[PDB]
Amino acid sequence: AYWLMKSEPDELSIEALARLGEARWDGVRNYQARNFLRAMSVGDEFFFYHSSCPQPGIAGIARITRAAYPDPTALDPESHYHDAKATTDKNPWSAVDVAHVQTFPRVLELGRLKQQAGLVELPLVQKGSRLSVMPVTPEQWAVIVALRL
């Protein structure tokens, strides 16, 4: 029921999601991350993580408004997430739709997060991880919301 998904601020920030209302989460091309997307249910919540930016960290909370469905950007030649070997009847990629829940006043910085022994099992803080979508245990969710104070 809980997850964490990374997104580059300039491509999509928690603030921008609040302004858009509901948005499509497309472009995931990592098999494992894809598999986690397919495990999500409507109503599930996830930490919105700002990555590849000057202040990386958890910026807020959002929710899943539409379970996994074929990522249309894979078939759209105009999209930067296009896949040449994908077709309508054979699309290996999935997307989900999300909506804003809350924007934290201050980003929960990555450094602060790595200092949480309670997050030792979260791929986010593990060396070499390239996973942009991951599950979050209730216990891990609690330690993170506790950081928000």
Domain boundaries, the chain: 1-149
| Degrees to nearest 5, angle at CA 33 with 30 and 37 | 130
Query: What CATH architecture applies to the domain 1-149?
Result: Roll (3.10)
Percent composition of the chain: helix, strand, coil (DSSP 3-state, to 5):
25, 35, 40
State CA 122 to chain mean position distance: 14
State the virtual CA torsion across 71, 85, 49, 102 in degrees, nearest 10. -10
Solved using: X-ray
Token duo for residue 78: 């105009």
Cross-strand partners of 57:
50, 109
Q: What is d(CA 67, CA 122) in angstroms, rounded to the nearest whole number? A: 23
Among 73, 78, 77, CA closest to 28: 73
CB neighbourhood size of 90 (10 A): 8
Give resolution in angstroms: 2.3
Q: What is the largest CA-CA distance in the chain?
A: 47
Cross-strand partners of 49:
6, 58
